[PDB]
Design a protein around this ligand. Structure first.
Ligand SMILES: *Cc1cc2c(cc1C)nc1c(=O)[nH]c(=O)nc-1n2C[C@H](O)[C@H](O)[C@H](O)COP(=O)(O)OP(=O)(O)OC[C@H]1O[C@@H](n2cnc3c(N)ncnc32)[C@H](O)[C@@H]1O
Ligand SMILES: C/C=C/CC/C=C/CC/C=C/CCCCCCC(=O)OC[C@H](COP(=O)(O)OCCN)OC(=O)CCCCCCC/C=C/C/C=C/CCC
Ligand code: HEM
Ligand SMILES: O=C(Nc1cccc(Oc2c(F)c(F)c(F)c(F)c2F)c1)c1ccccc1C(F)(F)F
Ligand code: SF4
Ligand code: F3S
Ligand code: FES
Lengths: 239, 613, 138, 102
């Protein structure tokens, strides 16, 4: 029987004048799943049911369980526990975010920024919609690979230090990549004014190529490359 | 009761559930011009529709020239003649219309040399009414088709002034004198209780896969709208019909798509033989979901296992070209790498039949209106609609055909919106609710918040999941089902002896998972009682004792030179089940299936026949 | 509700509540890309402060540059300490120059993958040492 | 919709490659004409560099207005200091040359 230690961030808004602290739980790795989420569920079921976290698919394709494990930001159902018992796994919520309770952060600002970029097809004339299928050639379709797979786990944006200092005015890796997605979507006629929307110091130009977004992405996507690719389009469009 | 703050909201239409079906109904209502409020316990993106990997069926005719009426025949043949043909007509005709609608919204569909949407071969489908070989009509965005569907529905839903109640757990329906008035909902975010009254209400809460121990469904797929309907004294249809998807990973119970089998994937047992040619001759490993899984679960009973305890079968993707897997099936290539710890291009993936889809649910006509059973007849419940997995327009019948559920979402979600737009106008009188209404739903919540018993939430949940897994499996006999029935009945009595720990208002997961447990149990009772009473083998429901397919006529031999069986004698009928919440007693009755189509001249009614692909 | 309203209601709820901000720098995993970007800011500020203190001294301080060089030879001549102060000037300059090229290569779109980033990061780190020692002794 | 933030970004990259090209140009060809061009590029790139640091850390409009104005005064003083040094005194090319061989 192998016993693993888990130190987890804890805060209760209902407790009178409570200060944020850490709490350690002991778990047998033979009667538990391989992933960190399985361990969190195990202590939820038996040890401590006060623990509060986001979870859904346990598959790594919904983005609910996004959190900070032993440093980086990854999905808890994708990251497997280190079998090395000599280390204590420290579990935190996403960095620089308002904690609602324990590992649950407020992502309201994150979703709100995603709305401001308009993530839907905009045609110049929509009198022929709902009847025709828009043609997109195989080569033009390939330009979406790496962009559409985004799950909105918010790991990349919350890994950005420039998002910690300016989380109100800087859109962040996740939202910025989706702007780019709808830019080269050759079915979208509104590519120009989408770029004109980023014509302020903060929206796009708070990026300084720190590359913490690309490194932490649990889906293996490259947000940083996409932001730099926008920057080029921004300098190369007329009228 | 003086403790909880009641905040009343007023709207034109409420859509409980923000999945694939929920979104199409939500934004479609505001597209018509309704003051629409969407309630959801998850964020719209996190909904279980992201897990969808296969595709969405449409008879566009992109690979080979296609007709939609063949897709009609395939679905009703797959439904084992329990599917209501009026609904199947509407879905298969609106199939090319809805997919074109989704592609125009922004769905990044895979493409061919022609530049059109890429369709693929899938299990259950055939050309020329089951005569012209294999059919290719499964529209897909590589392998993240359902994920991309939910994203391009969400993105498009921000174009309209739809109000969203993100992370709001819907408790019960606001009901007065057999008329729907809205919903009472708990806000997980702070702990408050909100009564959201509207002239119409759409229930799209998805399936109840969490009732079992092993399933491909999410931790949130507990099927609560089904229980909300149940607690109102309304019936639930065909809840015994639980689809066991053949290809699910042995480890965590995750799903790998039928698209694996569609491209040219083969199922291999310990002998090395292609064992799916042994059972199914014409269709082979690309047949109905109940056919393939039935072979798999029987191969284990013999002793032909392939694991450390001889309990699972193998799915092989070794022979397929490496470039085919990288382009067409990348979503399953990465998920099988993590959970199974096994490569896709050289090594085979361990598969096991697991709980996947619930064709049963809330009784529904083709328009999307919720039906109740009065005097052996069908009555429409005023202002109550249902679409998606939680609904049961019985477009799937006894067995769902692959890649039809995403179609079920988009078509019937839209149909729910169109039915409201015609029956009433935006700005019509919103029915006033009683001041002391829904207080019993709050009283129920207050007990579980301060629950002090002997069994915990998790322990009683485990006792339910394991009991359903061992008893109500793929094969089930009367003696086994009856022991399970009284075992599930005992656990419902134990729901008064439950112990809780968290007393907080803000984010009480210890409380909401117990709210889910009450709703899971109610969905478990009707599943097990409906299964034990049904003395036939039809689709997914297979009795070892009665392997006979009982219809009105014996359709195996010539027709009309034959005696027609009475209604309470055969078993080609829907299972409507009520359950008294107070004592936990199941009382069930039956209603006939709809054979007529919407137009006989345009689409012929397909009579029951010998079913084997 | 609009996208601008959603943000405005976000800050009014959180700033007027007893919610704690989640630890970030205190716990986040240190990496080379993150550390090398901080040094570019560090050297950037230090170099500007050096230039500014050179321009302002030309206006607000008496005596010509030749008189200041004769003033430099105060505490002996500095055996190898004259090399150390000369290394302390060229070291932050050379890091910023080589790392600045890497930034300029990035703005073209090249070398923005994790394997490429760790590689070209060492290339900048090694060139800094060789160019600084190479110019200090001249 | 005049694109100002994009041209500023382009302006940053143009003066960066210019200053990178002016360092070998000053070493290979050290003259009075090279002194002013190096002084112009050095003070411009520096001013725009700090401008990014200011817009990242200085929170709120209350202190941001004084920070950009306070920087602009320092940048003008720095450029004027170098132009005085190049015209009257030794010159920044020969100044390094004398400092290095000590
Ligand atoms: C499990 C599964 C299913 C699946 C699939 C792959 C997997 C792993 N792949 C499919 C495919 O390729 N093609 C296809 O046609 N179907 C496929 N399926 C089946 C299908 O995806 C499901 O039937 C579908 O996901 C159901 O969608 P629906 O919109 O009807 O339901 P949902 O997506 O699960 O959303 C439910 C929402 O309800 C909200 N909500 C709000 N309040 C509550 C309460 N109180 N209780 C429960 N739910 C509530 C939730 O927030 C959720 O968003
Ligand atoms: C503001 C200025 C403040 C002065 C401090 C900055 C000193 C650091 C500069 C490092 C560059 C070293 C250049 C090599 C050198 O020693 O030049 C002598 C050589 C002799 O001639 P020669 O005829 O080539 O000699 C024969 C040998 N080949 O070459 C030259 O003529 C001098 C050219 C140097 C120009 C580079 C100026 C860079 C200023 C950066 C400011 C950073 C502030 C900190
Ligand atoms: C000739 C060699 C140099 C090159 C190639 C260069 C290039 C660059 C570039 C491209 C940036 C912007 C990074 C970005 O945000 O994308 C930068 C930053 C900066 N540089 Fe330079 N530079 C050089 C020399 C200098 C010098 C001599 C100074 C001092 C006066 C200086 C001061 C700064 C400052 C203050 C910043 C701000 C840091 C930041 O970008 O956040 N640079 N450098
Ligand atoms: O400072 C930048 N990164 C950054 C990343 C991580 C931490 C950080 O603070 C520091 C720091 F550095 C230290 F040494 C400390 F001891 C310390 F206690 C900090 F809190 C700054 C940065 C670098 C380049 C461009 C833009 C930035 C920007 F925008 F501000 F994010
Ligand atoms: S780009 Fe990656 S890290 Fe960022 S939100 Fe999307 S999946 Fe998450
Ligand atoms: S982590 Fe942040 S700085 Fe830019 S490339 Fe990155 S968004
Ligand atoms: S829970 Fe779906 S991503 Fe971890």
């Amino acid at each position: 029987p192998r016993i693993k230690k888990f130190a987890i961030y804890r805060w209760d808004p209902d407790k009178t004048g409570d200060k944020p602290h850490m709490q350690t739980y002991e778990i047998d790795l033979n009667n538990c799943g391989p992933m960190v989420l399985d361990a969190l569920i195990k202590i939820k079921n038996e040890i401590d049911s006060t623990l509060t976290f986001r979870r859904s698919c346990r598959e790594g394709i919904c983005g609910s369980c996004a959190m900070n494990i032993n440093g980086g930001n990854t999905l808890a159902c994708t990251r497997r526990i280190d079998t090395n018992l000599d280390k204590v796994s420290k579990i935190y919520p996403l960095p620089h975010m308002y904690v609602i309770k324990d590992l649950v952060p407020d992502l309201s600002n994150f979703y709100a920024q995603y709305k401001s970029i308009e993530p839907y097809l905009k045609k110049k004339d929509e009198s022929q919609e709902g009847k025709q299928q828009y043609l997109q050639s195989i080569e033009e379709r390939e330009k979406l690979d790496g962009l559409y797979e985004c799950i909105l786990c918010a790991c990349c944006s919350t890994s950005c230090p420039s998002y910690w200092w300016n989380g109100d005015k800087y859109l962040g890796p996740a939202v910025l990549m989706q702007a780019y997605r709808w830019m080269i979507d050759s079915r979208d006629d509104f590519t120009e004014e989408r770029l004109a929307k980023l014509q302020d110091p903060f929206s796009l130009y708070r990026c300084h190529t720190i590359m913490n977004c690309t490194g932490t992405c649990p889906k293996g996507l490259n947000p940083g490359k996409a932001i730099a690719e926008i920057k080029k389009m921004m300098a190369t469009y007329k009228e | 009761s003086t403790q909880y703050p009641v905040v009343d909201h007023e709207f034109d239409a409420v859509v409980v559930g923000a999945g694939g079906a929920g979104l199409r109904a939500a934004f479609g209502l505001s597209e018509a011009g309704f003051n629409t409020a969407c309630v959801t316990k998850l964020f719209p993106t996190r909904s279980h529709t992201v897990a969808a990997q296969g595709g969405i069926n449409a008879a566009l005719g992109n690979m080979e020239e296609d007709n939609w009426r063949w897709h009609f025949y395939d679905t009703v043949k797959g439904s084992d003649w329990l599917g209501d043909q009026d609904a199947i007509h509407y879905m298969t005709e609106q199939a090319p219309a809805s997919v074109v609608e989704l592609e125009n919204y922004g769905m990044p569909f895979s493409r061919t040399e022609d530049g059109k949407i890429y369709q693929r071969a899938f299990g259950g489908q055939s050309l020329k009414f089951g005569k012209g070989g294999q059919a290719h009509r499964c529209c897909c965005v590589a392998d993240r088709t359902g994920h991309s569907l939910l994203h391009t529905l969400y993105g498009r839903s921000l174009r309209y002034d739809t109000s969203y109640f993100v992370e709001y757990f819907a408790l019960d329906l606001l009901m007065e004198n057999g008329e729907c008035r809205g919903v009472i909902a708990l806000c997980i975010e702070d702990g408050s209780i909100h009564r959201i009254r509207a002239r119409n209400t759409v229930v799209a809460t998805g399936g109840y896969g969490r009732t079992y121990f092993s399933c491909t469904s999410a931790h949130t797929s507990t099927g609560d709208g089904t229980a909300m309907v149940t607690r109102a004294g309304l019936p639930c249809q065909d809840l015994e019909f639980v689809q066991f998807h053949p290809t699910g990973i042995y480890g965590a119970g995750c799903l790998i798509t039928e698209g694996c089998r569609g491209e040219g994937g083969i199922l291999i047992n310990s002998q090395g033989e292609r064992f799916m040619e042994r059972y199914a001759p014409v269709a082979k490993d690309l047949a109905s979901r109940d056919v393939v899984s039935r072979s798999m679960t029987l191969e284990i009973r013999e002793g032909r296992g392939c694991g450390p305890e001889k309990d699972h079968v193998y799915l092989q993707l070794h022979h397929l070209p490496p470039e085919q897997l990288a382009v067409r099936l990348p979503g399953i290539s990465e998920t099988a790498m993590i959970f199974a710890g096994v490569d896709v291009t050289k090594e085979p993936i361990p598969v096991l039949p697991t709980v996947h889809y619930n064709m049963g649910g809330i009784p529904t006509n083709y328009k999307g209106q919720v039906l109740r059973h009065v005097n052996g007849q069908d009555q429409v419940v005023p202002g109550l609609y249902a679409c998606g997995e939680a609904a049961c327009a019985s477009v799937h019948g006894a067995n769902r055909l692959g890649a039809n559920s995403l179609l079920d979402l988009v078509v019937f979600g839209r149909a729910c919106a169109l039915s409201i737009a015609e029956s009433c106008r935006p700005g019509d009188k919103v029915p006033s609710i009683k001041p002391n209404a829904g207080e019993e739903s709050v009283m129920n919540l207050d007990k579980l918040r301060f629950a002090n018993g002997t069994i915990r939430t998790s322990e009683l949940r485990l006792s339910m999941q394991k009991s359903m897994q061992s008893h109500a499996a793929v094969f089930r006999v009367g003696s086994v089902l009856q022991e399970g029935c009284e075992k599930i009945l005992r656990l419902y009595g134990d729901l008064q002896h439950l112990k809780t720990f968290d007393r907080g208002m803000v984010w009480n997961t210890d409380l909401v998972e117990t709210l889910e447990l009450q709703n899971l149990m109610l969905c478990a009772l009707q599943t097990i009682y409906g299964a034990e009473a049904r003395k036939e083998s039809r689709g997914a429901h297979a009795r070892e004792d009665f392997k006979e397919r009982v219809d009105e006529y014996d359709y195996s031999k010539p027709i009309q030179g034959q005696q027609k069986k009475p209604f309470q004698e055969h078993w080609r009928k829907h299972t409507l089940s009520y359950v008294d919440v107070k004592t936990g007693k199941v009382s069930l009755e039956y209603r006939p299936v709809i054979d007529k189509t919407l137009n006989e001249a345009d689409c012929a009614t397909v009579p029951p026949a010998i079913r084997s692909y | 509700t609009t996208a601008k309203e959603e943000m405005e209601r976000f800050w009014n709820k959180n700033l007027g509540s007893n919610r704690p901000l989640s630890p970030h720098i205190t716990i986040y995993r240190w990496s080379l890309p993150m550390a090398m970007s901080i040094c570019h800011r560090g050297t950037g500020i230090a170099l500007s402060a050096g230039v500014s203190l050179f321009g302002l001294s030309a206006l607000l301080l008496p005596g010509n540059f030749e008189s200041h060089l004769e003033l430099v030879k105060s505490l002996c001549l500095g055996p190898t300490l004259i090399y150390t102060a000369k290394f302390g000037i060229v070291f932050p300059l050379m890091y910023h120059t080589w790392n600045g090229i890497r930034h300029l290569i990035w703005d073209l779109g090249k070398g923005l993958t994790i394997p490429q980033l760790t590689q070209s990061g060492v290339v900048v780190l090694i060139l800094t040492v060789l160019s600084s020692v190479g110019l200090a002794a001249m | 919709s005049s694109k100002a933030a994009s041209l500023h970004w382009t302006g940053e990259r143009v003066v960066s490659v210019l200053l990178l090209g002016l360092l070998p140009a000053a070493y290979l060809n050290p003259c009075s004409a090279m002194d002013y061009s190096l002084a112009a590029a050095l003070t411009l790139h520096g001013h725009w560099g700090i401008g990014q640091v200011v817009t990242d850390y200085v929170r709120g409009d209350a202190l941001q207005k004084a920070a950009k104005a306070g920087l602009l005064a320092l940048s003008a003083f720095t450029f004027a200091g170098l132009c005085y040094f190049n015209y009257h005194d030794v010159g920044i090319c020969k100044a390094v040359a004398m400092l290095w061989k000590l």
